[PDB]
Amino acid sequence: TEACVTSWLWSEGEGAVFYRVDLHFTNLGTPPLDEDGRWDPALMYNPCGPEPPAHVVRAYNQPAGDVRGVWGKGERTYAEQDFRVGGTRWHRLLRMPV
Amino acid sequence: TEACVTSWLWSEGEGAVFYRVDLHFTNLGTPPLDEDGRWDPALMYNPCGPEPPAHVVRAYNQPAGDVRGVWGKGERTYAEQDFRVGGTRWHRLLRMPV
Numbered sequence: 001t002e003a004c005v006t007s008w009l010w011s012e013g014e015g016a017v018f019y020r021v022d023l024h025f026t027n028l029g030t031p032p033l034d035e036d037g038r039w040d041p042a043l044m045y046n047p048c049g050p051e052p053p054a055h056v057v058r059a060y061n062q063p064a065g066d067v068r069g070v071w072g073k074g075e076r077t078y079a080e081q082d083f084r085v086g087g088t089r090w091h092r093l094l095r096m097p098v
Numbered sequence: 099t100e101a102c103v104t105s106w107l108w109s110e111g112e113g114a115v116f117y118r119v120d121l122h123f124t125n126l127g128t129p130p131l132d133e134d135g136r137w138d139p140a141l142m143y144n145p146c147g148p149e150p151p152a153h154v155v156r157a158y159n160q161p162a163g164d165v166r167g168v169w170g171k172g173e174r175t176y177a178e179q180d181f182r183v184g185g186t187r188w189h190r191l192l193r194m195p196v
Binding site (some may be wrong): 003004005006007008010012016017019020021022023024025026027028029030031032040042043044047048049051052053054056057058060061063064066067070071073074076078079084091093094096097098 | 101102103104106108109114115116117118119120121122123124125126127128129137138139140141143144145146147148149150151152154156158159161163169170172176182191192193195196
């Protein structure tokens with residue numbers, strides 16, 4: 001409802017799944033530790049749910065090198081990763097603008 | 099079919115920022131595929147928008163590897179990654195499952 005980018009994640013083999021991930025960004029102002037030093041209650045407050053299954057989350061955040069860069073409706077650049085975790089091969093697309 | 103999970107991210111220095119990121123995961127079931135069996139979603143589907151600022155997106159989508167801290171308690175626990183992107187230091191808290 002404010003600012004947004006998209007990612008994609010999918011697996012191969014039997015039980016292949018396919019996911020679109022929309023990343024909604026909400027500007028919260030200043031970094032949460034002020035010079036006083038009090039904490040912004042916004043930090044870790046009211047996390048959204050329910051959460052995706054554990055292997056899916058793990059797959060989304062697995063460290064992996066970029067195999068190539070792609071476009072991208074509207075010539076929008078994405079970095080692609082092709083990796084394996086938990087015996088399963090995953091493909092991942094991340095919005096990466098210059 | 100929907101699931102969601104929340105991240106936080108913030109930079110240091112002059113003009114530091116602080117964002118919430120709500121990652122909305124949508125299961126697309128079995129989408130149409132080409133020959134061989136390949137999905138090309140960056141070109142098939144429209145992305146969400148409008149986009150957040152460029153450098154914020156690059157920072158969130160950066161690889162960073164080194165889990166340097168664990169935040170929060172019990173069932174709402176977060177892994178912190180701590181990294182620079184061109185002279186700017188960033189912190190990114192990711193939900194980490196069980």
